[PDB]
Amino acid sequence: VDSVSASPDFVDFVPTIPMQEIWTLCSSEAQAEAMRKHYDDVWAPAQSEK
Amino acid sequence: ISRYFDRVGSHFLTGIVMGGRAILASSTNKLRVKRDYSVSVVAKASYEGL
Numbered sequence: 001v002d003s004v005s006a007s008p009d010f011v012d013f014v015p016t017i018p019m020q021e022i023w024t025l026c027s028s029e030a031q032a033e034a035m036r037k038h039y040d041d042v043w044a045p046a047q048s049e050k
Numbered sequence: 051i052s053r054y055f056d057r058v059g060s061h062f063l064t065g066i067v068m069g070g071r072a073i074l075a076s077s078t079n080k081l082r083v084k085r086d087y088s089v090s091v092v093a094k095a096s097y098e099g100l
Binding site (some may be wrong): 017026 | 056057059
């Protein structure tokens with residue numbers, strides 16, 4: 001417990017804003033939409049299946 | 051707008067109290083059952099002739 005006070009590790013999310021989509025960080029709406037569209041249509045289905 | 055309320059909230063805190071809270075809940079159940087039955091039977095015969 002003393003070590004946890006000195007060196008806590010990531011254990012859980014803040015449930016209000018846990019993570020942000022990476023294409024929010026994109027330079028450009030065309031790229032960002034392409035990433036979102038591919039994420040929605042292809043990658044997230046595959047990973048949820050995987 | 052919906053994303054804004056999602057990502058930063060519809061309100062902000064303007065009146066808060068600073069605290070400690072502790073809660074305990076505890077339960078115990080015990081059950082013991084004993085049942086036993088015993089049967090004893092004796093039959094005796096004595097018989098005689100001439």
